[PDB]
Design a protein around this ligand. Structure first.
Ligand SMILES: *[C@@H]1O[C@H](CO)[C@@H](O)[C@H](O)[C@H]1NC(C)=O
Ligand SMILES: *[C@@H]1O[C@H](CO)[C@@H](O)[C@H](O)[C@H]1NC(C)=O
Lengths: 162, 57, 54
């Protein structure tokens, strides 16, 4: 696997300061390495609508992956994103979909009360993808790329190098 | 015949119930084919060895 | 309605406008919706607008 940076940039009212206790780095305050949990700058102000696009200039196909976040209480979502009806859409020259956040009472789990679901799509050479969102987007900051071929093995036993 | 196979069944599985059944059916059918094919092949070749050796004598 | 002695096959489609300047002119300002119901089939769709490529 290889990598290429997104190049994405965000406005003054968008940030990536959100941190979760469920992930283990230097005391707990951290998040995934290559995804950004966008939230509003100020408290009590809505998430601004922003359009973002990505270009592919490599001679090979890529694999862009992102996620959407499901709050677990009405008291939660308004603080993070705002009081409007959130919605996001994704469109390439070969892909088209739409998602919507939703909230409701849910169980407790090892990390907080909430869920996030991830999505992915393939991108072709000379092809672009576009993201339209105003909240709930776990926007990637670095994208992956796959090359060559390998062999997957799934077991549990000591390794031997001789 | 150096055909190389790859996994289609996840050992730490969370699979559906329809496609799982479809994959299950073919595996047993082919497994029975190999078991039935192999058993007759060996039993069939043993007949020639006994017959051939008796002829050389 | 089908009055023939054999099954048929019916096709339709939905329109995804690429900008808010489109839908308000073509269809209106209300929340568009569509539902399809036979005696064996039942589904629902919704138009959605957003910035997209060329
Ligand atoms: C993506 O954007 C670039 C910008 O230079 C453009 O040249 C290219 O045609 C676009 N690709 C598609 C598939 O629209
Ligand atoms: C298929 O076979 C596996 C292995 O024996 C078994 O665990 C499973 O219950 C069977 N049925 C499925 C996967 O629907």
């Amino acid at each position: 696997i290889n990598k290429i940076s997104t190049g994405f940039t965000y406005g003054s009212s968008i940030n990536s300061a959100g941190t979760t206790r469920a992930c283990m780095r230097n005391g707990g305050n951290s998040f995934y390495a290559e995804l950004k949990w966008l939230v509003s700058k100020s408290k009590g102000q809505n998430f601004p609508q922003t359009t973002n696009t990505y270009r592919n200039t490599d001679t090979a196909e890529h694999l862009i992956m992102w996620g959407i976040h499901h709050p677990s209480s009405t008291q939660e979502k308004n603080d993070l994103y705002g009081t409007q009806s959130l919605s996001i859409s994704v469109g390439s020259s070969t892909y088209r979909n739409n998602f919507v956040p939703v909230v409701g009472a849910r169980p407790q789990v090892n990390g907080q009360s909430g869920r996030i679901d991830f999505h992915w799509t393939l991108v072709q050479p000379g092809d672009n993808i576009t993201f339209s969102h105003n909240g709930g987007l776990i926007a990637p900051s670095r994208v992956s790329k796959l090359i060559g071929r390998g062999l997957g093995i799934q077991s549990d036993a000591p390794i031997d190098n001789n | 015949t150096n055909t190389e196979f790859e996994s289609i069944e996840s050992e730490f599985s969370e699979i559906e119930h329809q496609i799982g059944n479809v994959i299950n059916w073919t595996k047993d059918s082919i497994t029975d084919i190999w078991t039935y094919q192999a058993e007759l092949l060996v039993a069939m070749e043993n007949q020639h060895t006994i017959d051939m050796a008796d002829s050389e004598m």
